[PDB]
Amino acid sequence: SWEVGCGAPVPLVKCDENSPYRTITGDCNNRRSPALGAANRALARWLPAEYEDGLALPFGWTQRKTRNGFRVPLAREVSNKIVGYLDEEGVLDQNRSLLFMQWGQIVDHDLDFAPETELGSNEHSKTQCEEYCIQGDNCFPIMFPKNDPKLKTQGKCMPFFRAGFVCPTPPYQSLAREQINAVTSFLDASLVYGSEPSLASRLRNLSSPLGLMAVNQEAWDHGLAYLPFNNKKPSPCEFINTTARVPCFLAGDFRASEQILLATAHTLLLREHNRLARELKKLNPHWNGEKLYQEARKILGAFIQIITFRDYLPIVLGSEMQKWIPPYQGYNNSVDPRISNVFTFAFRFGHMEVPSTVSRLDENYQPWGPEAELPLHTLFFNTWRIIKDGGIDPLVRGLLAKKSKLMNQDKMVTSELRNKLFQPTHKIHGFDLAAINLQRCRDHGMPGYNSWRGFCGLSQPKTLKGLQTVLKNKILAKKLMDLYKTPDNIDIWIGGNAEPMVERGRVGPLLACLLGRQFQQIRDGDRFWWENPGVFTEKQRDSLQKVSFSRLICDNTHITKVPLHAFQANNYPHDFVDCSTVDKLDLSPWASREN
Ligand code: HEM
Ligand SMILES: *[C@@H]1O[C@H](CO)[C@@H](O[C@@H]2O[C@H](CO)[C@@H](O)[C@H](O)[C@H]2NC(C)=O)[C@H](O)[C@H]1NC(C)=O
Ligand SMILES: *[C@@H]1O[C@H](CO)[C@@H](O[C@@H]2O[C@H](CO)[C@@H](O)[C@H](O)[C@H]2NC(C)=O)[C@H](O)[C@H]1NC(C)=O
Ligand SMILES: *[C@@H]1O[C@H](CO)[C@@H](O)[C@H](O)[C@H]1NC(C)=O
Ligand SMILES: *[C@@H]1O[C@H](CO)[C@@H](O)[C@H](O)[C@H]1NC(C)=O
Ligand SMILES: O=C1O[C@H]([C@@H](O)CO)C(O)=C1O
Numbered sequence: 001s002w003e004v005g006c007g008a009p010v011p012l013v014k015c016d017e018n019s020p021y022r023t024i025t026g027d028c029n030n031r032r033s034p035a036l037g038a039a040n041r042a043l044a045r046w047l048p049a050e051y052e053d054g055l056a057l058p059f060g061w062t063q064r065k066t067r068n069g070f071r072v073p074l075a076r077e078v079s080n081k082i083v084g085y086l087d088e089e090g091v092l093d094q095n096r097s098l099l100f101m102q103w104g105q106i107v108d109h110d111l112d113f114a115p116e117t118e119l120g121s122n123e124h125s126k127t128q129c130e131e132y133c134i135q136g137d138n139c140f141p142i143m144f145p146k147n148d149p150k151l152k153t154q155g156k157c158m159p160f161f162r163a164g165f166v167c168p169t170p171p172y173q174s175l176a177r178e179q180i181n182a183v184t185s186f187l188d189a190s191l192v193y194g195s196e197p198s199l200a201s202r203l204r205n206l207s208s209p210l211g212l213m214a215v216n217q218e219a220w221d222h223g224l225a226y227l228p229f230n231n232k233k234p235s236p237c238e239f240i241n242t243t244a245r246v247p248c249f250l251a252g253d254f255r256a257s258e259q260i261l262l263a264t265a266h267t268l269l270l271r272e273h274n275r276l277a278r279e280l281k282k283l284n285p286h287w288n289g290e291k292l293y294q295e296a297r298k299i300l301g302a303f304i305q306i307i308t309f310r311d312y313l314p315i316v317l318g319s320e321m322q323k324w325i326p327p328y329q330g331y332n333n334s335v336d337p338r339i340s341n342v343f344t345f346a347f348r349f350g351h352m353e354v355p356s357t358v359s360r361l362d363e364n365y366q367p368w369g370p371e372a373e374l375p376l377h378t379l380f381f382n383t384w385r386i387i388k389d390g391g392i393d394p395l396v397r398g399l400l401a402k403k404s405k406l407m408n409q410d411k412m413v414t415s416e417l418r419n420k421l422f423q424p425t426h427k428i429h430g431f432d433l434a435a436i437n438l439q440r441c442r443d444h445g446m447p448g449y450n451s452w453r454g455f456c457g458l459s460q461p462k463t464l465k466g467l468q469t470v471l472k473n474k475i476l477a478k479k480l481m482d483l484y485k486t487p488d489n490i491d492i493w494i495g496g497n498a499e500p501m502v503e504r505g506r507v508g509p510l511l512a513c514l515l516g517r518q519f520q521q522i523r524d525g526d527r528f529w530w531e532n533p534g535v536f537t538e539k540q541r542d543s544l545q546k547v548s549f550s551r552l553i554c555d556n557t558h559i560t561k562v563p564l565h566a567f568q569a570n571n572y573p574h575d576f577v578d579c580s581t582v583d584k585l586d587l588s589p590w591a592s593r594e595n
C-alpha cells in the first residue's frame with residue numbers, strides 16, 4: 001500500500017550493467033534493486049522506530065513524558081551507575097590480542113556510519129549546545145545527573161547533536177525518522193577507498209597511471225607510506241597539540257584518525273593497496289591505471305572479508321557462529337544486504353573491549369623509549385605520536401603483543417572513553433562514549449531491550465528476578481531495575497551488552513543473534529562476495545585462502561616476528577614465528593597474458 005521512495009539522497013544511479021567492479025557508492029550490487037546497500041541512504045529498520053512521539057523525537061526529550069509509564073534515566077546517570085569502574089588490573093582478555101578490538105572497529109567503519117547533522121553549523125547555536133545546554137532541534141544535550149563530578153568542572157551538560165536523517169536536514173511531521181548510513185553496507189573496503197566518488201577520487205594517485213593510492217608528501221615512515229593529511233582546518237589532530245601541528249589523515253572513511261591504533265590499521269591497508277598495485281604492474285605492464293587500481297581494490301576487499309568471516313566472527317560469535325552464519329550457499333539477490341539501525345548499536349559491543357593504554361614496542365618487543373605506554377585518551381585524534389614519535393611498527397607490535405580488554409559486567413567501559421573522550425568541535429577531553437551511545441540509541445528511535453529479545457526469540461524478563469536470571473547477575477539487575485523501572489525500558493546498547501557471553505564467544509545471546517543475522521545478510525546479499533562463483537577464479541580464490549593478518553604486517557611494516565594467529569593472545573617470543581615462514585599472497589593467478 002505504501003511508498004517506494006522518499007529521500008534527499010538519490011543522485012544519479014546509472015548502472016554499468018556487466019562491469020567487474022563494485023561502484024564506490026555500493027549502487028548496482030543488486031540488479032533487481034540498484035540502491036540496496038548503497039551509501040547515503042536510510043539504515044534499514046528491522047523493527048519500527050520507537051520515538052517519544054511516534055515520529056522523530058527521542059525518549060527522554062520531553063521531561064513530563066514517560067516511556068511505558070516511567071522516566072528514561074539520564075544517559076550519564078546510567079553510565080555512572082552501571083558502565084564505569086576505577087580498577088584496570090584484571091580486566092584484560094586472556095585470549096584476545098589488542099588486534100581483536102581494532103579489527104572490530106575496522107570492520108565496523110567499513111559497514112556503517114550515521115554522522116551528526118549541521119544546519120546551525122558555522123554558527124554558535126552549535127556551540128550554543130555546549131555552552132548554554134538548551135535542548136532544541138538537533139541539539140539534544142547529555143545533561144549531568146545530581147552527584148556528577150563533571151558538574152563541578154564541565155558545566156551543565158556534554159553537548160550532543162542528533163544524527164542525520166532522510167529527506168531533509170530539519171523538519172519531520174509525516175513519517176518516522178530514519179537515520180542515514182553514509183557508507184556502503186557491503187564488506188567492500190569502503191573505509192580505504194571511500195563511499196563517495198568525490199572522495200574516492202581525491203584519495204587516488206592520478207599523477208602516475210600506476211594505480212597507486214595517493215600517499216603522504218610531508219612525511220614518510222622508514223620509507224614506507226603514510227596517508228595524506230586531510231588539509232582541512234581547523235583540524236582536531238592539530239588541536240590536541242598545536243606545537244606538533246600534525247593534521248589528521250585523509251582516508252576512505254572520515255573517522256580514521258579518531259584514535260592512533262585505528263589510524264595505524266588504515267595505514268597497513270593503504271600500504272597493502274600500493275604493494276598490490278606494484279606487484280600487479282610488474283606482472284601485467286599492459287594493465288592500465290584503472291585496471292591496476294580496480295584489481296587491487298578487489299583484492300583488498302576480499303582480504304577484509306576472509307579475515308572477518310574466517311578469523312574474526314567465529315571468536316566473536318563462538319558457539320552461535322553456526323546458528324547464524326552457516327555454510328556459504330552462494331549469492332542470493334533476495335537478501336536485504338542493508339545495515340539495520342540496531343546493528344550500528346549492537347556492534348558497539350566493541351567499546352567494552354578497549355583497554356586503557358596503548359604500547360609501543362621495539363624490535364625486542366620491549367617498552368619503546370621512556371613513554372612507551374600511553375593512556376588511551378591522549379591518543380584520540382593523535383597523529384603526531386605516529387609521525388614524530390616512532391612510526392607504526394611500535395604500535396603494530398603492541399597490537400599483537402598486547403591484549404584486548406575483556407567485557408566485564410562489573411567493569412564495562414574504561415574511563416579513558418567514559419570520562420576522557422575527545423570529540424571534534426569541542427575542546428575538551430571530557431566526553432563519555434557510553435552516555436553518548438545511550439543518547440544515540442534514543443536518538444535513532446531504538447525499541448527497548450525486550451522487543452529485541454522478542455525479535456530474537458528470547459525471554460522477556462518483566463521483573464527484577466527475571467533480569468537477574470537473564471543477566472546471571474543479582475547486582476547488575478538491581479541497578480538496572482532501579483534506573484529503568486522495567487526491563488522493557490532498558491536501552492538496547494546496555495541491555496545487549498550486559499548479558500553474559502556465549503561459550504567461546506565474546507557477546508551474549510541477544511547480541512550473537514543481532515550481530516549474526518547482519519553478517520549473514522552481509523555475505524549472502526553481496527553479488528561481489530569473494531567466493532560468489534565468478535568474481536575470482538579458483539586459482540585466485542585458492543590463493544586468497546592463504547591470507548593472514550600476519551602476512552599483512554610482514555609485507556607492510558619492518559617487523560620480522562609475527563604470530564600464526566594474530567587474534568588470540570600471543571606472547572613473545574614463544575607464540576612468535578618468523579615472517580619468512582608465513583605463507584604469502586601468490587598473485588600469479590592474476591597474471592593475464594592476454595595482451
Ligand atoms: C578506542 C576505540 C574506539 C573509540 C575511541 C571509539 C569512538 C567512537 C565514537 C566517538 C563514536 C560515535 C558515537 C555516537 O556519537 O554515536 C563511535 C561509534 C561507533 N563505534 Fe566506536 N570507538 C572505538 C572502538 C570501537 C570498536 C572497537 C567498535 C566495534 C567492534 C566500535 C563500533 C562502533 C559503532 C558501530 C559506532 C556507530 C557507527 C555508526 O555511526 O553507524 N567502536 N565510536
Ligand atoms: C604518485 O606516485 C609517484 C611515484 O610513483 C609520486 O611521484 C613523486 O614525487 C616524488 C617525491 O618524493 C619525486 O621523487 C617524483 O617527482 C615522483 N616519483 C615518481 C616515481 O614518479 C607521487 O608522489 C604520487 N602522487 C601523489 C599525489 O601522491
Ligand atoms: C605536542 O607535540 C610535540 C611535538 O610532537 C611534543 O614534543 C616532543 O616531546 C618532548 C618535549 O619535551 C621531546 O622528548 C620530543 O623530542 C619532542 N618532539 C619534537 C619533534 O620536538 C609534545 O610532547 C606535545 N605536547 C603536548 C602538550 O601534547
Ligand atoms: C583461544 O582461542 C582459540 C580460538 O579462538 C582456541 O582455539 C584456544 O583454545 C584458546 N586458547 C586457550 C589457551 O584457551
Ligand atoms: C534467498 O533469500 C531469501 C531470504 O533470505 C530466502 O527466501 C531464500 O530461501 C534464499 N535462497 C535459498 C536458496 O535458500
Ligand atoms: O568511530 C567513530 O569516531 C568518529 C568521530 O569521533 C570522528 O569523526 C565517529 O563519529 C565514529 O563513528
Ligand SMILES: [Ca+2]
Nearest residue numbers: 110184186190
Ligand atoms: Ca562498506
